[PDB]
Every structure is written in structure tokens, then in C-alpha cells.
Amino acid sequence: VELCSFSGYKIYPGHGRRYARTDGKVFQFLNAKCESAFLSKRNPRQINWTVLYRRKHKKG
Amino acid sequence: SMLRLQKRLASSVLRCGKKKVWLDPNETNEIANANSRQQIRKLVKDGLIIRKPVTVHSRARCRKN
Amino acid sequence: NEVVTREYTINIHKRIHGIGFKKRAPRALKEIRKFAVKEMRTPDVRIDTRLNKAVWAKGIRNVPYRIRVRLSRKRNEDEDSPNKLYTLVTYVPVTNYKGLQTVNVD
Amino acid sequence: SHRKFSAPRHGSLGFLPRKRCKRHRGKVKSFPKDDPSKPIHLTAFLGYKAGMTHIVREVDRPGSKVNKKEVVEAVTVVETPPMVIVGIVGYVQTPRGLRSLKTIFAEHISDECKRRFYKNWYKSKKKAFTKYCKKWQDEDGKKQLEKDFASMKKYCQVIRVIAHTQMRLLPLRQKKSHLMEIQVNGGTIAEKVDWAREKLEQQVVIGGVFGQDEMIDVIGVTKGKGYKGVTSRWHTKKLPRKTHRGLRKVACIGAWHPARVAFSVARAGQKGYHHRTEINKKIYKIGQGYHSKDGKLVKNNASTDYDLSDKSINPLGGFVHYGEVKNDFIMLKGCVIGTKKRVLTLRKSLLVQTSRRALEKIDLKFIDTTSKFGHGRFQTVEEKKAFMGPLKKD
Amino acid sequence: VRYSLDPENPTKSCKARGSNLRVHFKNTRETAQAIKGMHIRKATKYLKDVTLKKQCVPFRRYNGGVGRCAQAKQWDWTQGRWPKKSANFLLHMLKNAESNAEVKGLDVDSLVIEHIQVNKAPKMRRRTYRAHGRINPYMSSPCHIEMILTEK
Amino acid sequence: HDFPGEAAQIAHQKPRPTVEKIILIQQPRRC
RNA sequence: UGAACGAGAUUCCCACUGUCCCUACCUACUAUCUAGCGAAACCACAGCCAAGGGAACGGGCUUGGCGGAAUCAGCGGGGAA
RNA sequence: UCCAAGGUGAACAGCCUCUGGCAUGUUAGAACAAUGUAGGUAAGGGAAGUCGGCAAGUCAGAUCCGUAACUUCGGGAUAAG
RNA sequence: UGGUAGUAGCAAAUAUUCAAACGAGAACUUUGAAGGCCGAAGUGGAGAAGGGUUCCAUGUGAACAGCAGUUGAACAUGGGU
Ligand SMILES: [Mg+2]
Numbered sequence A: 001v002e003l004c005s006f007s008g009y010k011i012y013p014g015h016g017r018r019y020a021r022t023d024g025k026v027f028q029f030l031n032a033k034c035e036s037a038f039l040s041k042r043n044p045r046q047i048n049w050t051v052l053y054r055r056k057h058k059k060g
Numbered sequence B: 001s002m003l004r005l006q007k008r009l010a011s012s013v014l015r016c017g018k019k020k021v022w023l024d025p026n027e028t029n030e031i032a033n034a035n036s037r038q039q040i041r042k043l044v045k046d047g048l049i050i051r052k053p054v055t056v057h058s059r060a061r062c063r064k065n
Numbered sequence C: 001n002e003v004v005t006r007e008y009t010i011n012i013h014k015r016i017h018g019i020g021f022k023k024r025a026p027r028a029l030k031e032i033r034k035f036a037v038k039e040m041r042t043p044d045v046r047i048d049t050r051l052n053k054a055v056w057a058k059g060i061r062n063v064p065y066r067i068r069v070r071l072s073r074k075r076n077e078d079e080d081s082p083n084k085l086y087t088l089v090t091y092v093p094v095t096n097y098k099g100l101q102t103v104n105v106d
Numbered sequence D: 001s002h003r004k005f006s007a008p009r010h011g012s013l014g015f016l017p018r019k020r021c022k023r024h025r026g027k028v029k030s031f032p033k034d035d036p037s038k039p040i041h042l043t044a045f046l047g048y049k050a051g052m053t054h055i056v057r058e059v060d061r062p063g064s065k066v067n068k069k070e071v072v073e074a075v076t077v078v079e080t081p082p083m084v085i086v087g088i089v090g091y092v093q094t095p096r097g098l099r100s101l102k103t104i105f106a107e108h109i110s111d112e113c114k115r116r117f118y119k120n121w122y123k124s125k126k127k128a129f130t131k132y133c134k135k136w137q138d139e140d141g142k143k144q145l146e147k148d149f150a151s152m153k154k155y156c157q158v159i160r161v162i163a164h165t166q167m168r169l170l171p172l173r174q175k176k177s178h179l180m181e182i183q184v185n186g187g188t189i190a191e192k193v194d195w196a197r198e199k200l201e202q203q204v205v206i207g208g209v210f211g212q213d214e215m216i217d218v219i220g221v222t223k224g225k226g227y228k229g230v231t232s233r234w235h236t237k238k239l240p241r242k243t244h245r246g247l248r249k250v251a252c253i254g255a256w257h258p259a260r261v262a263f264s265v266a267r268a269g270q271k272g273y274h275h276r277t278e279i280n281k282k283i284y285k286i287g288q289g290y291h292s293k294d295g296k297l298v299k300n301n302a303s304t305d306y307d308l309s310d311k312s313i314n315p316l317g318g319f320v321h322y323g324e325v326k327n328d329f330i331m332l333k334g335c336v337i338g339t340k341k342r343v344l345t346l347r348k349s350l351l352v353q354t355s356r357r358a359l360e361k362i363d364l365k366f367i368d369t370t371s372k373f374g375h376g377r378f379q380t381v382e383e384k385k386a387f388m389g390p391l392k393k394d
Numbered sequence E: 001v002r003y004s005l006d007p008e009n010p011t012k013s014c015k016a017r018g019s020n021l022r023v024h025f026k027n028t029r030e031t032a033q034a035i036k037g038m039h040i041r042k043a044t045k046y047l048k049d050v051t052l053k054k055q056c057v058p059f060r061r062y063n064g065g066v067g068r069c070a071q072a073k074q075w076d077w078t079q080g081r082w083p084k085k086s087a088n089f090l091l092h093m094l095k096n097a098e099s100n101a102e103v104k105g106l107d108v109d110s111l112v113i114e115h116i117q118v119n120k121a122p123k124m125r126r127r128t129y130r131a132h133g134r135i136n137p138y139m140s141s142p143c144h145i146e147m148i149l150t151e152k
Numbered sequence F: 001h002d003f004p005g006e007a008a009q010i011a012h013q014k015p016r017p018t019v020e021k022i023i024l025i026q027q028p029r030r031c
Numbered sequence G: 001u002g003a004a005c006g007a008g009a010u011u012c013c014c015a016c017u018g019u020c021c022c023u024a025c026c027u028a029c030u031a032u033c034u035a036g037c038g039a040a041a042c043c044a045c046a047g048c049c050a051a052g053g054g055a056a057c058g059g060g061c062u063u064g065g066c067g068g069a070a071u072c073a074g075c076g077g078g079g080a081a
Numbered sequence H: 001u002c003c004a005a006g007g008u009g010a011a012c013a014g015c016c017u018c019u020g021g022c023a024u025g026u027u028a029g030a031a032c033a034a035u036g037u038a039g040g041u042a043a044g045g046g047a048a049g050u051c052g053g054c055a056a057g058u059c060a061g062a063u064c065c066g067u068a069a070c071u072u073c074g075g076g077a078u079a080a081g
Numbered sequence I: 001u002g003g004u005a006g007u008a009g010c011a012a013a014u015a016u017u018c019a020a021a022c023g024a025g026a027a028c029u030u031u032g033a034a035g036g037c038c039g040a041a042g043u044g045g046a047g048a049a050g051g052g053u054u055c056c057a058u059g060u061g062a063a064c065a066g067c068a069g070u071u072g073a074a075c076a077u078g079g080g081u
């Protein structure tokens, strides 16, 4: 069980995809919503529905 | 019943188009008896034939940009 | 109690699901007419002209998802039609549709 | 004139004709061979395809690259409430095949079972088996019934059992149950009739028919796709783009001679809704329905020895297009034929299961309960509320 | 005029016919065969149910290309339609027949259609325009209808 | 005037002729 | 020979793309069903095959296979259409 | 052939509106199967399809830069990037 | 005059809907309302060549206007440069 590299959500054994860049970094994505945003160079802390946003803005 | 003659005469009397002519829907029988331009000019004074205003094309959006 | 009047919330969004753009608004006004026959068991339904403007308020392909409608089964008393009853469907302009149950109107 | 480059044909001629199945409930066309040595047992059971999910288990096959490794395997949930036995049928083997000799129905038959005997149950007087049930009480009927039970033990060689599902225990719209003959493969005919007689108007759970780690067969009807072209019906090559008068066809439907279109030539027609029988479906878990143990209804049929989470087999929002599985269910590896809420007739395998995969004992470690009505990311409701915290709807 | 199949006994039957009726012969022939032997109270209700798509007209002979409806089970047939114009022209003729029975003093409540035939009127001529500067016929198929109503 | 049909279409009917006069290489090789 | 030019013929490369691997899905109008309306080409008779003989590739004759009302949507083997 | 509004824009381009005009072009209702005609998308690979990059797609406006071989010195040239 | 056959077809140019009126009869006429299109190289307003009463009013609904029609460039009667 891993965490999403973009949304910070919890990933279960049969969900999401795994992305391994050419430089040796491996990322876990929850779904194609978080995967396409990651490839679009979207900053997570600027995305309202992610976990990094709720920690930066202390929404928890 | 069929008021195509009154819809056409009211266009030349009111100096407007057929799309700007308003015939009273509750007084179609009185309009139907108007077969001359003198009777059409009589109904425009009685308020049965009203010239509808021009459709609003506001330039406030153009004047703002 | 033949002459009765109620107010319904016709969910148009689930009655025009899968309809083409040029056919959504006319079908929306055909489902309202069908809604007035199933609830009020009486043919010859007359839809008020103010309701025609409500379902056509946002064009022909964007119909309001839900609409507040008042069904009032009235009596002809003038014509010799085999129905002897008719339901006038009027438009009830409301802002919020949450919690709006089906109520009776006197 | 021969085709220069060889290529296999575009379908199996053993599933002809590709017509709509004349029946809706799958039909067991061959029961397991009766062996008088083993104890008395049923060889079939009706189920309803609830939905699919995936599990996590540790494979234990020596010599594989996946040995002692966690795997995510797709499984299907088949809700199987207990069936009520309401009939016994004896078969005599004739030179023209088996023949139904006697048929003894139960004394009491529920209204959901009598619904099968009608096409318009709402406007019909509930008269089915009203004069037949009196035979179980009249002294003339009892003596005639005793002669029928003795006729099965003396003349019949194949004893089957009529059973029906309990659709009151399903979230489905259909109230008309499904009747089915389930052959008894236990022992002598005298014991099979006595065993079936004591099982009349009595429920039979799927835990008694099948067991854990058992390769069973799934019979039923596939998903109806309607009229389909030859490109989708037989999976042929699409003609090039510049093809006039259509490109999703078969170009040549036969040579000049024979001057007739052959039955082997792929043609356009109805696809789907065909009767099928897929074998070797391993049972991963036999879940228990909701039952009050000590005053509180337990819903724990999706917990494993390593998960321990109090969660039911139903995911968040229930199985999509089916409902809520509140009864005993089976968990088969992979997919099974039919749409959702499709009645499936589970059957024991006609073969002897001795392979390495058939004898492999499966131990589930985690069952997925995320919502299948979208991209579910939470197993339970409390896990979702503990992660997202309090919302505005509080 | 002269009808085919003169009734077995006059003064107990009424006649009603029509000439050059602009109705399709093939649709009207199959409609007349459905009301053959029907009571007029049953025939008038049936023809009104055909115009309302409630009861079908089984196309027995001229059934090439016509569809298959669920209402055809009642006629032990597969192909059936609901000719509205054919049923309306027969309702007007069946109403004129009841007018012929009330003037003669017949019991309208017991009339039975014992004989009804549909002939072919002279075809009216219209033209259609085809490809390559050709004009093909666009004829109509009218029909002469006659019926005799008897008391049973 | 009880001949309305034919007297109204007599000016619209136009006579037509009895018969309307309207207006592959095919050589295989290996001779 | 040749700059410029070309809805001219041709070869390669880059880029691009369902041309393809290998198809899938969505939309509009048709097809489809109903009401009304309503043709045309074509037609010796007609219409299930195998083989044989035959004007040397039958649909009909010969010997066999056999053959069950009325039809719908398709289809492009055949009718040397 | 004659007269030719507002907005966007280089534009009598395209798109939207006003004056004016019309009722969707010789029919309607229901359904959304195959196959079509028209429109669109498709992961990974990128012409392996095919006589042939046919069809489709890529590129595109303007601004600031940068622009070879060759040449009849005019050009090529919106080269290309 | 048939079979074909009540079959092909009535599918180019986004789109109609509600109520009322007249009427035996309204998806098609008329009035009103709403939603749209042409978007000033118009589906706008006037001519030339050509047509020759098609113009206008009233009336008819029989034939024609490939569905219908209470409508028409149809038919009938008057008028008009
Ligand atoms: Mg149920």
C-alpha cells in the first residue's frame, strides 16, 4: 500500500499506475486524474483538492 | 381567421416590417373586418394594432471594450 | 373529489437522458404532458404558455434539470368531449428544488 | 487459386448457430457421473451474478516466479441464497435416452415458486398445485404417493431434485423464482429417494453443495449485444478505407463453386445472449449472509485473517447495477458469463480435479471494497470519514 | 347499381356501398377481411381501436414488407398494421349502413356484416420525376367498397 | 358545372411520346 | 544546361498522423417501425443439392440426398443476374 | 446588375447581433440494430498499410530574431531553425 | 393489365414548441408567446432578359400542389398598369 505522488491519497494494491522516469525516479499515481496533472507540471500545493494543499492551508 | 391582409397593410401603414406588427390576439374579429388602409389607420388609434419596439442591440458591451 | 390541484417536481433531467440536442426541449414538453396523464388520470392536457417559456428558457438543447409544476385537474363544463376533465399544467417559479415534496393545493 | 498466405478461420464452428438462447436460465446439459461410493450430495446450484472485484492473496505454487508473492486477481461475486427443494423426479434409462417416470412435488409450495407456473401472476387466481397438495393429506393420495416413491426406488436409475431460488432475499425486481432439476449423485436409488424425500420443503445452502478450493463450472447466457456486423460478430479484418459500398464486411463470402454460401462463411447476425458453459472456475471464498449472532446483525463477509476490518462484501454504494449482497455468496476466480443480476447455474466439474492449480488452497489476504461506481479510493465509510474529516453536511 | 351476393332475404338486411374512394386497395382489403362476420357494435369498436393503434389489422395476402406487431397474436398471424385511412372510410360506410337499417326499421343492435368486398376503382394518374430526365407513373389505387348487414 | 375535376386539369396535362428516345474494352491478353 | 515557376511524373529524409499492428467508442442523417403517399428495372416457366450423361459448367432429365404454411431484417455464393 | 448596419479582425474572411425576412426547403411520430453517408477521438508503436503517405494529420496569425545550396543577381524566402 | 409491391422511396443547406381562433376535420392555416436561422458579396429591398395575369380581393376544397391543408403561383368570379 503506497501513497499517490500527486494527490497524497492512499493507493491500494489494485489501483492506479506506476511511473518510472528516465532519471531513476519512480512515482505512484492514484488515477489518470492525478497522473495527467503531474505530467502537466501542475504544482500540487496549488491544487485545492490535494493533501499538500490542506496542509499548506491548514484545512485539516 | 386568416389575417395576412391586415398583417401586410399594417406594415405599410405603420411604415415598419411584418415582424414589428402586433395584432391583438383577443380582438381578431374586429381586425378581420379591416380590409382597407383607412380601417387599419383606425385600429392603430384604438390600440389593436401596435408597432412592437426594435429588438435591443445594446452597444454597452462595445462601448466598454 | 375530481377537481384537484397539486404541485410536483418533474425531474426533466432523467426524462430526456440520451436525446439529441435538437429534440431535448420538445421531448421535455412531451414528458411533462405524459407526467400529467400518469398522475392525473385524464387526457387532454393543456400546458400553460408560461411553462413553455420555462422549459425553453435556456435554448433547445439545455433544458432545466428539474422544474416545479402545478397539476390542476379541472372540468370542461363547456365542450362535449369524451374526457369532461382537463388538467392545466402551470409553472411554479422556484429558486431551490431541495426538499420540495409533493403537496396539495386548494 | 489457393490462398497464398495461410490464416486460421475467424471463429469456432462448434458454437453454431449464433442465435439468441431460447431460454434465459442456463441449462445443465450433463451432470457429473453418478458414483455410488461417495456420500449423497447435490451437483448443481443456482446463483446470481452480483458483480466483480479484485482480491489480494499469496500464491503458493513451488517453482514459479510468483511463488510466495502477493497478487491482485479479479473475482466475481455470485450471490447465492439458499434454495428450497419442492420436487423429486425419477428417470428411467430407455434405449431412446432418459425419460421422466415420476414427479413428486412437495406438499407446500411458496407463492414465489408458483410464480414460475404463470405468465400473468397478478391477474391469475393462485390455483397451481391446489388440488395436488390435497394428495398429501387424503388417505387415497397418500397411498398413491407411496406407490410413486416405491416406483422411483424400483424403476428409476437417475433421481433428480427440483429446487427454486428465494428471490425475496434479492434486491432484484423479479419476484418469479427459477426452478431447476439438480441431480443427486450419492448412492443407491433407495437412498437417493429417501434423502430427497426428507429434503422436501427444506432449504439447501451453497456451503453444502460446493466447497472451498473447488473447480466448478459456470453455465448461463452471455450478454446480449443485439444485431452485430461480421467485424464484431466474427472479428474479421476491416477492409481498407477506400472500399466502396462498405468496409466492415467480409469481402468474399464464397467461391463460384459451390454456387451456395457456406455455413462456415462468417455472416452478420445476432451477437451475444448465447448459452455458454465455462469450466474450471475456482471458488475463492464462500461468504455468509447477514445473520444476527448475539442481537447485532454482523456484516463481516469481506474480512480476512490479515485484514480484520468489519466490512461487508458490498463496496461503497453497493454493487453497481445490482444492489446489496445480503445472503451467502460465492467468489469465483476471474469473470463469468452474463450481465449483472444474471441467474447462473453453478455445476460441479465433470472432470477429476488433480492438477497443481485445482488443488491449490487459496487464502485471501485483502478483498477490495472500493466504490466501483467511479474511481473509489476508500474501503469503508469510517475510513473515508476519518481521512476527509468532518464536512459541511454535519 | 347491383351488389354481388344478393342477401338471402331482403327486408331483413341493409346495404351500403361506395365508389372511387381514395383509399389504398391493399390496405382496405385487409381491413374489410377483419370485419367480415363481425357484429357492427364489435366492428365499430374494432375500427376505432385500429385508428388508435389498439387492435391490429392482420395483413394476410398483401403482407410483403409489412412489419410484425405484438397485436398480431390475437389473429394467429405475424404481420399486422393499423390502417387509419382504411378504418375511417369503413367507419363512414358502416355508419351509413346503420342509417339504412334504421330507416328500413331493422334492429341495429343485431346487425352482422355477412358480406363485404373491396374492388379496384380506376387508377388516378400522377407523375413522378426520376433520374436522367425520365418520368415514371405515380398512380393511386382507389377501391370500390360494398357491404351487406344482416340480423342474426 | 358538375365537371370540375377534368375541366381544372385539362390545362395541366401534357402529352408524352409513346417511346422516350434516350441517349468495357474487353480484350484479354495471352493470345 | 538551367535560376524562378508547376492542382505535372518520380526517389529519399524529417515531422505528422487509426494507412497499418487492431480495432474500439461517440454524434448527425439514413437504414429500421408506424400514419399518409407510392414507383422502376426485370420476368418462357420458375427457383434446395451431389454425381452422371448432355451443345463437353442443370434448376427442370437420370440415379441418389431429400422436401412442411406465411414471412421480417440482412446478405452479396448462384441465377454462366 | 443596384443599395450594404454593429462587434471581432488587416479584411466585402470566418463567427455573433440589429433592420428586414423566413419556418429548415415535395411529410411526420417512435426507436438508436447491422451496413452506410457526414463529423470526431483513440493508449503504445509511427507508413510496418498501399501500385503509391491515397485519405487524414502536422504547420498556420502577428511580433521579435534567424534564414543556406543555387542563381539569369531579380530571386530562392513565410527557405529552414 | 400483372408479379415486383404497399417494396424502393417521401434523408443536401442546425429547429422547433405552447396556447388560442376559424372549421365536420389542425404536426402543416391564422394570431400571440417562446426558442432559432439568413447575419448587409442576406433566406433583405428594387430592376434588366425572360414569363404573361402568375398581381389584388372574395369564394371553392373536386382534380393538382409526390403527407395533409380551413392554404396556394391550383380552381371559380370580379378588379388592377
Ligand atoms: Mg427481488
Ligand SMILES: [Mg+2]
Pocket (backbone or CB within 6 Å): D242, D243, D244
Ligand atoms: Mg472508390
Ligand SMILES: [Mg+2]
Pocket (backbone or CB within 6 Å): D320, D371, D372, D373, D374
Ligand atoms: Mg466501475
Ligand SMILES: [Mg+2]
Pocket (backbone or CB within 6 Å): E133
Ligand atoms: Mg431534366
Ligand SMILES: [Mg+2]
Pocket (backbone or CB within 6 Å): G006, G007, G008
Ligand atoms: Mg500544375
Ligand SMILES: [Mg+2]
Pocket (backbone or CB within 6 Å): G059
Ligand atoms: Mg438455369
Ligand SMILES: [Mg+2]
Pocket (backbone or CB within 6 Å): none
Ligand atoms: Mg451480365
Ligand SMILES: [Mg+2]
Pocket (backbone or CB within 6 Å): H024
Ligand atoms: Mg433540417
Ligand SMILES: [Mg+2]
Pocket (backbone or CB within 6 Å): none
Ligand atoms: Mg495511436
Ligand SMILES: [Mg+2]
Pocket (backbone or CB within 6 Å): none
Ligand atoms: Mg512499403
Ligand SMILES: [Mg+2]
Pocket (backbone or CB within 6 Å): none
Ligand atoms: Mg494528400
Ligand SMILES: [Mg+2]
Pocket (backbone or CB within 6 Å): H079
Ligand atoms: Mg528551396
Ligand SMILES: [Mg+2]
Pocket (backbone or CB within 6 Å): none
Ligand atoms: Mg396571390
Ligand SMILES: [Mg+2]
Pocket (backbone or CB within 6 Å): none
Ligand atoms: Mg386568392
Ligand SMILES: [Mg+2]
Pocket (backbone or CB within 6 Å): none
Ligand atoms: Mg398532396
Ligand SMILES: [Mg+2]
Pocket (backbone or CB within 6 Å): none
Ligand atoms: Mg387560374
